[PDB]
């Protein structure tokens, strides 16, 4: 299924993705594993940990 943004994030570098909590951020692609998944933001883009995003179920 698809997951939505749950917890917020904090800047780090030119790779991470700083977003807000309960924000509209869904995973589009993965890192080819169950570690991290790449997501996009209305502001820009960046990486997003699955530990910061949960499924819709």
Curated annotation (Swiss-Prot):
Phosphorylation at Tyr-7 by members of the SRC family of kinases disrupts SH3 domain-based autoinhibitory interactions and intermolecular associations, such as that with ABI1, and also enhances kinase activity. Polyubiquitinated. Polyubiquitination of ABL1 leads to degradation. It is linked to Leukemia, chronic myeloid: A clonal myeloproliferative disorder of a pluripotent stem cell with a specific cytogenetic abnormality, the Philadelphia chromosome (Ph), involving myeloid, erythroid, megakaryocytic, B-lymphoid, and sometimes T-lymphoid cells, but not marrow fibroblasts. This is Tyrosine-protein kinase ABL1. Residues 2-56 form the SH3 domain. The chain holds residues 65 to 119 of 1130 of the full protein. Widely expressed. Belongs to the protein kinase superfamily. Tyr protein kinase family. ABL subfamily. The gene is ABL1. The modification Phosphotyrosine is found at residues 7, 52. It is found in: Cytoplasm, Cytoskeleton; Nucleus; Mitochondrion. Non-receptor tyrosine-protein kinase that plays a role in many key processes linked to cell growth and survival such as cytoskeleton remodeling in response to extracellular stimuli, cell motility and adhesion, receptor endocytosis, autophagy, DNA damage response and apoptosis. Coordinates actin remodeling through tyrosine phosphorylation of proteins controlling cytoskeleton dynamics like WASF3 (involved in branch formation); ANXA1 (involved in membrane anchoring); DBN1, DBNL, CTTN, RAPH1 and ENAH (involved in signaling); or MAPT and PXN (microtubule-binding proteins). It comes from Homo sapiens. Interacts with SORBS1 following insulin stimulation. Found in a trimolecular complex containing CDK5 and CABLES1. Interacts with CABLES1 and PSTPIP1. Interacts with ZDHHC16, ITGB1 and HCK. Interacts with STX17; probably phosphorylates STX17. Interacts with INPPL1/SHIP2. Interacts with ABI1, ABI2, BCR, CRK, FGR, FYN, HCK, LYN, PSMA7 RAD9A, RAD51, RAD52, TP73 and WASF3.
